[PDB]
Design a protein around this ligand. Structure first.
Ligand SMILES: CNC(=O)c1cc2cccnc2s1
Length: 121
């Protein structure tokens, strides 16, 4: 149907917008602390603490599979990256502090993304 194609075009475009957001958010992590899953080889007990791990590579995988249906689902995953890190790591660590900075600097990007999604539809 022509309708299904139109939906696919929108989802493709949402994916295009979300890819730009993802790139902008990952740019705020030059230390690449959040680039990859927390290694279960280095942190064997990680899953005893964190029940839903997340990272930018995992987000990117879901993104290119067009697995984000709206901005809210994308934001939930971003929030997981930050919130997991701020629970697993203590307040006076490079890890916790990086998450705080990512959350603060990411808010600006996400603020405009929300306006743009509504605006463009
Ligand atoms: C977002 N990253 C993290 O939360 C952590 C990474 C590592 C690496 C070695 C030991 N502990 C940790 S905790």
């Amino acid at each position: 149907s022509m309708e299904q194609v139109a939906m696919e075009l929108r989802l493709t475009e949402l994916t295009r917008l979300l890819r730009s957001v993802l790139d902008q958010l990952q740019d705020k992590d030059p230390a690449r602390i959040f680039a990859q899953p927390v290694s279960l080889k280095e942190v064997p007990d990680y899953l005893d603490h964190i029940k839903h791990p997340m990272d930018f590579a995992t987000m990117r995988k879901r993104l290119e599979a067009q697995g984000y249906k709206n901005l809210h689902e994308f934001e939930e995953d971003f929030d997981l990256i930050i919130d997991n890190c701020m629970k697993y790591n203590a307040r006076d660590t490079v890890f916790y502090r990086a998450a705080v900075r990512l959350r603060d600097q990411g808010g600006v990007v996400l603020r405009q993304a929300r306006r743009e999604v509504d605006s463009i539809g």
